[PDB]
Amino acid sequence: GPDQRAQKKGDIILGGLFPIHFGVAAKDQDLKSRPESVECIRYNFRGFRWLQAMIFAIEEINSSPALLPNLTLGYRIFDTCNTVSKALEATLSFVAQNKIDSLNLDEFCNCSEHIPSTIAVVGATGSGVSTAVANLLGLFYIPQVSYASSSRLLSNKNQFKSFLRTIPNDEHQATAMADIIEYFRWNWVGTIAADDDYGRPGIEKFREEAEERDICIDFSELISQYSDEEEIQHVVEVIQNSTAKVIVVFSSGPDLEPLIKEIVRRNITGKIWLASEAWASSSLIAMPQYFHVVGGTIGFALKAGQIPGFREFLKKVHPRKSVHNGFAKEFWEETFNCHLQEFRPLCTGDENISSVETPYIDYTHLRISYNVYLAVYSIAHALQDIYTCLPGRGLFTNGSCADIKKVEAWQVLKHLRHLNFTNNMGEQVTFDECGDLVGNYSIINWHLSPEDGSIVFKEVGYYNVYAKKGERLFINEEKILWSGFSREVPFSNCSRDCLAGTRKGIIEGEPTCCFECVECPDGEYSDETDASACNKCPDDFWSNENHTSCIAKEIEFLSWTEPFGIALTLFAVLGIFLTAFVLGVFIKFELSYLLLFSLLCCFSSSLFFIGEPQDWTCRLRQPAFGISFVLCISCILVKTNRQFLLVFLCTFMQIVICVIWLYTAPPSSYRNQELEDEIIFITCHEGSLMALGFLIGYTCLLAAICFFFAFKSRKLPENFNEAKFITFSMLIFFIVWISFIPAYASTYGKFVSAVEVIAILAASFGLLACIFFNKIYI
Amino acid sequence: GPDQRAQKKGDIILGGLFPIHFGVAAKDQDLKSRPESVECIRYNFRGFRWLQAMIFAIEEINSSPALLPNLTLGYRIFDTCNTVSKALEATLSFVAQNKIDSLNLDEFCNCSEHIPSTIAVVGATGSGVSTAVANLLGLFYIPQVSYASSSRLLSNKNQFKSFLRTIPNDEHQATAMADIIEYFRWNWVGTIAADDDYGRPGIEKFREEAEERDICIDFSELISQYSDEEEIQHVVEVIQNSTAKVIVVFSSGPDLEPLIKEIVRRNITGKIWLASEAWASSSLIAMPQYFHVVGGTIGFALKAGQIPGFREFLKKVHPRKSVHNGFAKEFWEETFNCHLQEFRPLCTGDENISSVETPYIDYTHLRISYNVYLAVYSIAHALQDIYTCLPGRGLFTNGSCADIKKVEAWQVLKHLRHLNFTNNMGEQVTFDECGDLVGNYSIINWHLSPEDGSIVFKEVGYYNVYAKKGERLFINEEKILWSGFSREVPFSNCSRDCLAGTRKGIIEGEPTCCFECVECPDGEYSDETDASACNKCPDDFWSNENHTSCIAKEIEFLSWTEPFGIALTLFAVLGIFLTAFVLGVFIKFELSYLLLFSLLCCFSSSLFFIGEPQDWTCRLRQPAFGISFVLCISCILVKTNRQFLLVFLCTFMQIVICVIWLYTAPPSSYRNQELEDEIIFITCHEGSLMALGFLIGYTCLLAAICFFFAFKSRKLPENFNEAKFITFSMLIFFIVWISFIPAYASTYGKFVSAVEVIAILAASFGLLACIFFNKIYI
Numbered sequence A, B: 001g002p003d004q005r006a007q008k009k010g011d012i013i014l015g016g017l018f019p020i021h022f023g024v025a026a027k028d029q030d031l032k033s034r035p036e037s038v039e040c041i042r043y044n045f046r047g048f049r050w051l052q053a054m055i056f057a058i059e060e061i062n063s064s065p066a067l068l069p070n071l072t073l074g075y076r077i078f079d080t081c082n083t084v085s086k087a088l089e090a091t092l093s094f095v096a097q098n099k100i101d102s103l104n105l106d107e108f109c110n111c112s113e114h115i116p117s118t119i120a121v122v123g124a125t126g127s128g129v130s131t132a133v134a135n136l137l138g139l140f141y142i143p144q145v146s147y148a149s150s151s152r153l154l155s156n157k158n159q160f161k162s163f164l165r166t167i168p169n170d171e172h173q174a175t176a177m178a179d180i181i182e183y184f185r186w187n188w189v190g191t192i193a194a195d196d197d198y199g200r201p202g203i204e205k206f207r208e209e210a211e212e213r214d215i216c217i218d219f220s221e222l223i224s225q226y227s228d229e230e231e232i233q234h235v236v237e238v239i240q241n242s243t244a245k246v247i248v249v250f251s252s253g254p255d256l257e258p259l260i261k262e263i264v265r266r267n268i269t270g271k272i273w274l275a276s277e278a279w280a281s282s283s284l285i286a287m288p289q290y291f292h293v294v295g296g297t298i299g300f301a302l303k304a305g306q307i308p309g310f311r312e313f314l315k316k317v318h319p320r321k322s323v324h325n326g327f328a329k330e331f332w333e334e335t336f337n338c339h340l341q342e343f344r345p346l347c348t349g350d351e352n353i354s355s356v357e358t359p360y361i362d363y364t365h366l367r368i369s370y371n372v373y374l375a376v377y378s379i380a381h382a383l384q385d386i387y388t389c390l391p392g393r394g395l396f397t398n399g400s401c402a403d404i405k406k407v408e409a410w411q412v413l414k415h416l417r418h419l420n421f422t423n424n425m426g427e428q429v430t431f432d433e434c435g436d437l438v439g440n441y442s443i444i445n446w447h448l449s450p451e452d453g454s455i456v457f458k459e460v461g462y463y464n465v466y467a468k469k470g471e472r473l474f475i476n477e478e479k480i481l482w483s484g485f486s487r488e489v490p491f492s493n494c495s496r497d498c499l500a501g502t503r504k505g506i507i508e509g510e511p512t513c514c515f516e517c518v519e520c521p522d523g524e525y526s527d528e529t530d531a532s533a534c535n536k537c538p539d540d541f542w543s544n545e546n547h548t549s550c551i552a553k554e555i556e557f558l559s560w561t562e563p564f565g566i567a568l569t570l571f572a573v574l575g576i577f578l579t580a581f582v583l584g585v586f587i588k589f590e591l592s593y594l595l596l597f598s599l600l601c602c603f604s605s606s607l608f609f610i611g612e613p614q615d616w617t618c619r620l621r622q623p624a625f626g627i628s629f630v631l632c633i634s635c636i637l638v639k640t641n642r643q644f645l646l647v648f649l650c651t652f653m654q655i656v657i658c659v660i661w662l663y664t665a666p667p668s669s670y671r672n673q674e675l676e677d678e679i680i681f682i683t684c685h686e687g688s689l690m691a692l693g694f695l696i697g698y699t700c701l702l703a704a705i706c707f708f709f710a711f712k713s714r715k716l717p718e719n720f721n722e723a724k725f726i727t728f729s730m731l732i733f734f735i736v737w738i739s740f741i742p743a744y745a746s747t748y749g750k751f752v753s754a755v756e757v758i759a760i761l762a763a764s765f766g767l768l769a770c771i772f773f774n775k776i777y778i
């Protein structure tokens, strides 16, 4: 028992376990010398006022005779300054009078002290520490109740049989941790836990929250308060080497603390902080000297509990009045940084309490203090139930309660499994199967007092714990300032929600949290910013310039009343009117009715075989063979060796061949798709070979017959040598049919049939000239 | 202290911790009743003879006065039947007299017993148990030395400061575990560990061994002795649902035991067993009732240690002589299954020792027994060093040894850090930084005694521990029988080493342990069975039928002396000889010298323009134009309107045009690659247009000139109307040059130039007929 032992007598010893220092030295006893304990080198005024709260509620339960009359209460309280070694050293001293069943050597002077047993005990802060000692207490079923350890591992009543707590489990915390960025709607996030049993199981639970919500986890590192500076350099190189503005820290204070100093030295700004409440209310972190990089820190916290007499008991302090305190004197000379002694001067003992800004007194709220304060009263209330035994009707084997003069900690734990009673602020606080309770969490922001530069902890909503899943959250969205000041929401996806036409693909190797969006052209119709694929639009439709919705058309190659064709139709109509005036002058002065009608019919069927494409407008290509063959038969049968009925042995033979090709030809336009951008066309789908066959067998045959007959008439001037102009009209016309063999066989595009139509029309006009002009010039 | 407490007095208490039962019951005290200890329901005769070995070496060290004269040795030995709860209950009773520094209430009658302290202690079997108690003993620096716990975690002297052992670390075990299948050269393997701190760190170390050796791990499951039958069904569904004949089990006995029963019920055969030595010497596993599926089990083991008096002390047993034993009576009535009492009858106490086949006595070897037996002697030897203090020159702060009448366990541990002494079988057994030693491992096989059906454990090699990495292994390959009997090696890759031409690719999604081999055709040259890709072979070479090495050629289209061309050359030579006899008869009876030489030169240049392709053999196509144009000029200039020098105004004009085309033509064969399989060709790379230009401007021009001149001579019989046969020879020849316009313009393959050559040759023969026959038939 050190001078840090905190003890006063009483009928039930309690004992408590507390971090008087955050840090412990790591000196190495090297065993040529005798070993000894190691110094613990930090402080925790929050822990010291937890002690003050402990003995305060001790004083309440002793003084207030409604709370257990005629009974005084022992305690032997020790200083677990985050060292499980010292914790073990403590708890062995705890289970000594409880270990008197195994003690079998010291009979006649154990009664020389006759010290009773510690029937239950306050638990501890650190989860690893409490799990260390829970293994010891599960032997003896000593009821131990932690005030701060809140891991899901301790719910295992197989190993940790004898353990309850006064704090909710971490699972709703990890739940709401997923839910707040579910609200904040992000994809690329990175987390940090601590290297312990508070960091690892909580981050595993939260990792499964994230894998429900499908968030590409950028990193997951573990830390301690005794970490390597090279490892800290490694993880800050990770932090500088990643794309995650959001940072989940799921640690305690002193574990993030060297990382905090390393960052405020290293000075990376912009990354923002989800906060574990183990450090989210901690002025060693919450420093103005740190606030140049920390701000907008968002954490849960327990609601503030209120204690009558709290600050009063805090200021009821004196070093000479330390009748039962362990570290009052060190506390006095440490707060005041002097050296009272029974350089650093002799302390007055009378220095003003609020002359210093101590976190013993600098609080705004009471949370784990409050948990302690209610925890001891829950112990007192189960013991009050034991005090008020129902007479043979208790919770025992046949209800026989133990007497208060001879109690049993297993029976204590039996009553502790079932407790149902109200709080000092009127909350019916029961104990579930985990042996805890659960309240809501104020979700806070880390703002600054503009009057003083003091970091103020400003709630921007709260997480209810009583609604359904997906129903337990409140957001005060109004007081939200992202990164402390900026009311606008930042970005923690990996890729952007891209542009419209960029079809949102994926990236192989990388999770689909981060992906690509492929710029899909040429009929995509992709106007949604996150369309995964494209849309193949309709056949008359082609995409916009940004590969957007399709409005643009394909080709429209018809050329019905085109402006190029208007002048050619004017030339054709002029030739028709000139031929009409010529025929009028000739009739006043077969060549006027039949041959002139065949020539003007091949010149009017050339006009009718232009225009738009249709079925019959496609099928109309026959009369340019027929009427022109009749006009050519007029030339081949107006010879001097003298025809309608008699040279119909040729002409009607070609006419029956024309009826055969009329039966054989296909009467249907063909709007083909030759190209793809300028796709549509008109092709007229002609049947097999009837056009070239009729051309060779009629027109070229008549030209050859006229040449073979007029081979003698060329060297024979008859009717002023009309064979010369006859063979010249045949030269123009056979030049058409044999040079637009190559020209209309070497045509292209929407002028292909137009070229043959112009060839036939010009050949008609030229034959009309070289025949009728030579006929009727005089 | 139970009746299982094992105690006799003496100046230094030792204490030991042992599994009297494998299994402990899991009854649930439900706290309406008073709690109590839980029964431990199994047995371990190997542990009971470990006790016998313990007290045997105790007896040695007491009796043998060379080992510590004038000093008696206490012990208080307890029964850690694999229950860490009972272990904790034990070790608290251990550190009680050592905990007398904290004991501050029992002064005047602690001396009523005056019990001294337990200065050191035997460790424990289970790694979890020893790590539990090592946390307790690191407080007091009580030197604890395990006999069976062998995990690498305990080498951490930060937490486990006060711990040494008598067993090598698991790292060489995992090393050799990689090395044996490295020898056995496999790729797809699956492992099984246990759900503890012996299974998990060992399988992590071995997993990193495997990831060095790059073996696709099929599965990794964890087990315990208290596992769920649904989980056992899950992992046996994994075992039936995988492709891994090799199975690494890295557990203890009772963890694999329910899996062993589940498998021998479930009856899957064929899978083979790498073995952790914690169960590889265990007759509960090594059952003949199990040997129907277990066999060929290959495990390491520690070498056999030998103890004088071993079996002797084993048979020095009696229940009434149990002057210090804990479980002798239960052992007696459990071995004999009777009920001696101070139904199951009253035991005689005189039953024959080897009347039963008990694994207390059924051994072949002594291993962990031997570790215990040497461990206590190492303790005795460090204490013998303490007994022989060097007078002020010890290992202390200035060498002042502690007296033996007042000792200190920290000083004990200081001397225990440095020990250097020989074994009973003469091994200088020191203690390293882990505080252990390391010997080789007999690598055994699980064969069967054919005389008795007894499972015999047959070494097939050993793993040395003193050579280098990659040097520490011996294999007796001769006694290797895979799966117990089969001397041939099995298969534990995933894919096969495939066929030759199948180019060994990979599989996306699956590790390259298991992969594909793509059947690569068409010039692969892939004759290696595991070639990753193919080989593009030479241009004259094409792959075999199995896409193997390329030997097959491409095309060889040359046709120099082909058998089809031999008969045509015979026809040409026959026409030449007939023309020679015809010219001889005509000269005896320009047409004989010049025109006949031009015709026979176009008929001999047709022969010279056949054969193989070369540069000049390509360039030779000019003379078929030249000499035939001279022969045609003979026909066009032997007219009746009468030539060499005068019609050279045409003929020499064409000859200068022929010299111009001779300058313009390219003289080079072109072995092109038209196809790819039958690739090679011959194309002769002719220059631009000189052939068609010379043809039209000379041959067709001369034919037109002859027709336009003989238009009158056709209707004119002169020299018996030779214009008829003249125009008939021109009909054959212009039919050649104007129909092999289409035929030699519509040719294909290696007969393309052959067709034009045959056309020119036949045209020469036909012109020779239709001229010279009509000339000289009479």
Ligand SMILES: *[C@@H]1O[C@H](CO)[C@@H](O[C@@H]2O[C@H](CO)[C@@H](O)[C@H](O)[C@H]2NC(C)=O)[C@H](O)[C@H]1NC(C)=O
Residues within 6 Å of the ligand: A185, A186, A187, A490, A491, A492, A493, A497
């Ligand atoms: C980060 O990624 C998530 C996933 O797409 C985005 O959440 C989407 O938000 C839009 C509206 O903002 C909703 O219509 C979608 O239904 C959400 N997706 C899912 C899967 O629910 C989020 O918006 C992204 N962040 C930013 C800043 O755009």
Ligand SMILES: *[C@@H]1O[C@H](CO)[C@@H](O[C@@H]2O[C@H](CO)[C@@H](O)[C@H](O)[C@H]2NC(C)=O)[C@H](O)[C@H]1NC(C)=O
Residues within 6 Å of the ligand: A439, A440, A464, A465, A466, A467
């Ligand atoms: C925790 O959150 C609950 C919300 O489920 C709070 O409930 C409030 O209850 C009062 C009276 O029952 C209502 O008037 C309020 O409207 C409720 N608040 C809501 C619905 O947001 C509850 O007070 C909170 N605190 C505790 C300790 O339970």
Ligand SMILES: *[C@@H]1O[C@H](CO)[C@@H](O[C@@H]2O[C@H](CO)[C@@H](O)[C@H](O)[C@H]2NC(C)=O)[C@H](O)[C@H]1NC(C)=O
Residues within 6 Å of the ligand: B185, B186, B187, B490, B491, B492, B493, B497
């Ligand atoms: C299982 O896979 C390994 C990996 O390829 C094979 O080991 C190869 O064995 C051949 C000869 O057997 C050696 O030439 C190679 O060098 C080995 N590979 C490596 C990476 O070293 C093994 O042979 C395969 N098993 C079977 C049965 O073929």
Ligand SMILES: *[C@@H]1O[C@H](CO)[C@@H](O[C@@H]2O[C@H](CO)[C@@H](O)[C@H](O)[C@H]2NC(C)=O)[C@H](O)[C@H]1NC(C)=O
Residues within 6 Å of the ligand: B439, B440, B464, B465, B466, B467
């Ligand atoms: C462990 O293996 C070593 C091999 O490194 C054994 O060494 C033998 O040593 C003797 C004498 O020194 C030699 O004659 C043998 O040839 C060695 N065996 C070999 C090289 O295989 C050693 O005996 C083994 N056992 C122990 C306990 O160390």
Ligand SMILES: *[C@@H]1O[C@H](CO)[C@@H](O)[C@H](O)[C@H]1NC(C)=O
Residues within 6 Å of the ligand: A267, A268, A269
């Ligand atoms: C840290 O970085 C921020 C980023 O702008 C900068 O404003 C600030 O001055 C930096 N501080 C130090 C100490 O480098």
Ligand SMILES: *[C@@H]1O[C@H](CO)[C@@H](O)[C@H](O)[C@H]1NC(C)=O
Residues within 6 Å of the ligand: A397, A398, A400
């Ligand atoms: C009532 O209590 C007695 C004594 O404790 C016990 O023997 C008895 O079994 C109990 N009765 C029942 C019904 O449990």
Ligand SMILES: *[C@@H]1O[C@H](CO)[C@@H](O)[C@H](O)[C@H]1NC(C)=O
Residues within 6 Å of the ligand: A420, A421, A428, A430
């Ligand atoms: C027990 O708890 C229920 C629910 O909170 C409550 O209604 C009841 O009054 C409680 N009983 C006692 C005795 O506290």
Ligand SMILES: *[C@@H]1O[C@H](CO)[C@@H](O)[C@H](O)[C@H]1NC(C)=O
Residues within 6 Å of the ligand: B267, B268, B269
């Ligand atoms: C188990 O399977 C093996 C496989 O052939 C078979 O030989 C053996 O008879 C089976 N045993 C039982 C009990 O099903």
Ligand SMILES: *[C@@H]1O[C@H](CO)[C@@H](O)[C@H](O)[C@H]1NC(C)=O
Residues within 6 Å of the ligand: B397, B398, B400
């Ligand atoms: C020798 O031993 C004495 C007493 O133990 C000690 O005071 C002294 O420092 C030692 N000398 C040295 C050099 O360590």
Ligand SMILES: *[C@@H]1O[C@H](CO)[C@@H](O)[C@H](O)[C@H]1NC(C)=O
Residues within 6 Å of the ligand: B420, B421, B428, B430
């Ligand atoms: C110490 O160990 C070394 C190496 O085994 C040996 O040579 C030496 O003899 C040992 N000394 C003693 C005193 O055992």
